[PDB]
Design an enzyme around this catalytic site. Structure first.
Site, mmCIF file in Angstrom:
data_model
loop_
_atom_site.group_PDB
_atom_site.id
_atom_site.type_symbol
_atom_site.label_atom_id
_atom_site.label_comp_id
_atom_site.label_asym_id
_atom_site.label_seq_id
_atom_site.Cartn_x
_atom_site.Cartn_y
_atom_site.Cartn_z
ATOM 1 N N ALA A 111 -13.944 -19.789 -16.912
ATOM 2 C CA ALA A 111 -12.997 -18.676 -16.959
ATOM 3 C C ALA A 111 -13.078 -18.023 -18.336
ATOM 4 O O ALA A 111 -12.505 -18.530 -19.305
ATOM 5 C CB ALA A 111 -11.579 -19.145 -16.654
ATOM 6 N N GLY A 163 -11.888 -14.800 -19.970
ATOM 7 C CA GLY A 163 -11.031 -13.635 -19.802
ATOM 8 C C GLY A 163 -9.627 -13.913 -20.297
ATOM 9 O O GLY A 163 -9.417 -14.761 -21.172
ATOM 10 N N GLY A 164 -8.670 -13.188 -19.722
ATOM 11 C CA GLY A 164 -7.286 -13.352 -20.116
ATOM 12 C C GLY A 164 -6.758 -14.741 -19.809
ATOM 13 O O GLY A 164 -7.318 -15.493 -19.009
ATOM 14 N N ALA A 165 -5.648 -15.080 -20.471
ATOM 15 C CA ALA A 165 -5.033 -16.389 -20.283
ATOM 16 C C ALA A 165 -4.550 -16.603 -18.856
ATOM 17 O O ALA A 165 -4.420 -17.754 -18.424
ATOM 18 C CB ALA A 165 -3.869 -16.571 -21.259
ATOM 19 N N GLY A 166 -4.276 -15.527 -18.116
ATOM 20 C CA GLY A 166 -3.917 -15.681 -16.716
ATOM 21 C C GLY A 166 -5.071 -16.191 -15.876
ATOM 22 O O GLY A 166 -4.880 -17.017 -14.978
ATOM 23 N N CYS A 186 -13.695 -11.353 -29.096
ATOM 24 C CA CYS A 186 -12.540 -12.217 -29.319
ATOM 25 C C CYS A 186 -12.562 -12.894 -30.683
ATOM 26 O O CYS A 186 -11.523 -13.397 -31.124
ATOM 27 C CB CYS A 186 -12.452 -13.272 -28.213
ATOM 28 S SG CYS A 186 -11.932 -12.616 -26.610
#
Lengths: 447, 447
Positions: B182, B184-187, B236
């Site tokens: 994964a 990407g965003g923390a979601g 990032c």
């Protein structure tokens, strides 16, 4: 649960200021109190969990405590731990925070000790969620460990235990912690990998054993019997099958009988044991961790006194016989093979049935056969010429001592190795600039 | 989704028969097709994602593809890979199975390439779920990679992509695969660690930068500006703050201005930028990955042409200013410090605000200061005397090349290191019996 987590973070921040030496003093005393109270813990575990052998649990506490401490006593787990000038790298060990550890019923004493020693070795705290049928002896283990931590001046509440382990409380505990350890059933492991936090679990065991042609069948029989009967066979790495060559089948069986096995070949009688160990395709909970005679009486078959294990002739490999599944009792299934490649295929089919990713055993002097089995079998540990229960560590092999044996992606675990201190610390890297290094050209990279 | 999973498992069993050399031929071609199509991929990514810089994405495809292949070209990932006779151990590398990879909008080309190279390197298959605002350019990357795989005779469907990524379909994809990536965003990362499967993710970035006293402020300014402005600051690991000494503050600011920075000290003018970058406590999505002039126009502040970055005097450390959060745009927040210990405390407070576990930068000639910051800061990577965007790999540092930078337990990730081929393989152990080993006595263990 919220109170336990906060009390653990307050302790973890105080524990983070500890040096390598101060942490090592705590970790040693944690294992030593289990060693010093091995006889009491074993008596309580047998009575409460109603499974296992007292004498084997005493040896378990003596072995697991000393083996884990002897392995991590000189490991660097605090601050800068490693220099690598060839890559201009400096490695830094940092704690992960609060550890949520769910412990099993089969190892209710050594598992809280093992997880606590590995967690505190890396300046982490731990909250222990014991198995309901073993909560008393697991709490007594935590109690005596905290008593030793108090005498050493350790920060309070670095080890805590849930006295009321509700199913929602365990879910909240694993979601609130920084890292999760799940030693137990597949349901407990799946919940650990569903908590939104990094987790470490185990997979179902089903150690397949191959006896190669020409090996010392007497020594192979002694090792397999020692592993199968240990603690009445509740260890997840315990021997489950005997895959013996057809041309020497009677010789291998004779070596098992010589060393205390009771072999059954008749179609009936074998069915009398099969219908007692498995009811509706699942293991009979009333024989889990029970002696040979208890299984014999329930099966209605006379088994001589002094028998150590029961060997049952299987109908076939894989799903052709439910006996090829995991058996948490001193019972083995026996299967014949023609070629060593077919022997691996037999072990492969039983792993696809149950237990893929865990441990296998092999007794051979042919290094090519040993390397071929370890190359293709879906296992994390291939145990060679020794009891398979040594997969969790012995002073005669290289496996890292532990009580939590990860089973890799097959068993839906993050690692395919024994759980140590290293999986409970974050290793950071200081990256210096290597101005002397040269950038490869297009030809150097893609040529 | 079930069809994609099954096709991936069929391909994975075919790919599992590949030797080390046959796998390496596929991995090299996956990186070369991104290198050879860098100019086209970069143009499509800028137009579709509406963020980043064309020339920087061209250099991204050239660097990432070559650096990843140059690092893994000679790494052993198939079968028996390592001998360790001192521990009587033999290491065997085995595939994990099907990889479910969710790729971000910031790196829509190199991330599918990076994950596919690392997965196939260990005989795994991969299913890519792209970001919705980058699904076209990510699918084109998979298309050209599959076109090169077909010409090499590779098994079909070793790389697949979901063209209709439903929210329930993405959930089922992660739960059905053997291991999840994964990026990407923390979601997306939280859903990966909530799937019941071993997952690898990232955390929010917020690279704090300490400029140490006496350092070449000109070189420090050039490196920080290079990292902050790269791809309009959507990496990032991009520099986020300038923690500069108060006694040399004007000198450091002058070095940034000399190298293309526009420094803003007027509180009213800083507020015009602050109210544009952050709206309701969160970053304004309309300025993510946008140029300096676009941000200047929206803020209503004249910024000279040729300006590379914007530096804003912050109100204070931590939550005293929202500018201390992650800013995915070429904007830096400037802060003063008295002692180097305070400089670390300032970066510490910013990481507790956002970004704990990711990357930090430091420009210093004092190795004691470098080692102290790396020892206490909650980071996975401390980048020394170079642009912080080299945290993902560089030919002049030791960080492993990657596009997926794990952030440890702080960022709720399984590892505190860069994602490589090694995290997608199971490493098993063949444990031989060391009969010559000695069992330590009670005195040897607890003495």
């Amino acid at each position: 649960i919220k109170e336990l987590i906060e009390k653990a973070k307050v302790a973890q921040k105080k524990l983070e200021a500890y040096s390598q030496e101060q942490v090592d003093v705590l970790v040693k005393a944690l294992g030593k109190v289990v060693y010093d109270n091995a006889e009491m813990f074993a008596k309580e575990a047998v009575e409460e969990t109603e499974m296992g052998v007292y004498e084997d649990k005493v040896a378990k506490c003596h072995l697991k405590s000393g083996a884990i401490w002897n392995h991590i006593k000189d490991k660097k787990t605090v601050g800068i731990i490693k220099e690598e000038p060839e890559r201009a790298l400096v490695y830094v060990a940092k704690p992960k925070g609060v550890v949520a550890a769910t412990t099993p019923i089969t190892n209710p004493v050594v598992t809280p000790m093992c997880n606590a020693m590995a967690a505190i070795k890396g300046r982490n705290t731990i909250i222990v969620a014991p198995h309901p049928k073993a909560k008393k002896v697991s709490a007594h283990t935590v109690e005596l460990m905290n008593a030793e931590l108090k005498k050493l001046g350790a920060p309070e509440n670095i080890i805590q235990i849930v006295e009321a382990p509700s199913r929602e409380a365990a879910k909240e505990l694993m979601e609130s912690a920084d890292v999760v350890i799940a030693t137990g059933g597949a349901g407990r492991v799946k919940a650990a990998y569903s908590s939104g936090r990094p987790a470490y679990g185990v997979g179902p065991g089903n150690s397949q054993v191959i006896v190669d042609k020409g090996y010392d069948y007497n020594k192979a029989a002694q090792d397999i019997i020692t592993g199968r009967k240990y603690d009445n066979g509740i260890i997840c790495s315990s021997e489950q099958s005997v895959i013996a060559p057809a041309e020497d089948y009677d010789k291998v069986i004779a070596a098992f009988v010589e060393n205390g096995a009771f072999y059954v070949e008749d179609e009936e009688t074998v069915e009398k044991f099969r219908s007692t160990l498995f009811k509706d395709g699942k293991i009979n909970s009333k024989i889990i961790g029970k002696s040979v005679q208890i299984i014999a009486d329930l099966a209605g078959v006379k088994v001589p006194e002094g028998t150590k294990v029961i060997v049952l002739k299987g109908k076939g490999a894989g799903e052709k016989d439910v006996l090829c599944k995991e058996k948490m009792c001193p019972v083995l299934v026996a299967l014949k093979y023609d070629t060593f490649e077919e022997a691996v295929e037999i072990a492969m089919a039983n792993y696809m049935y149950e237990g893929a990713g865990h441990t296998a055993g092999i007794h051979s002097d042919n290094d090519e056969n040993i390397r071929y089995a370890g190359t293709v079998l879906p296992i994390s540990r291939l145990v060679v010429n020794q009891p398979a229960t040594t997969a969790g560590g012995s002073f005669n092999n290289g496996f890292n001592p532990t009580t939590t044996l990860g089973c890799g992606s097959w068993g839906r675990n993050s690692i395919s190795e024994n759980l140590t201190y290293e999986h409970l610390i974050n290793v950071s890297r200081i990256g210096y600039f290597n101005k002397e290094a040269k950038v490869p050209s297009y030809e150097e990279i893609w040529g």
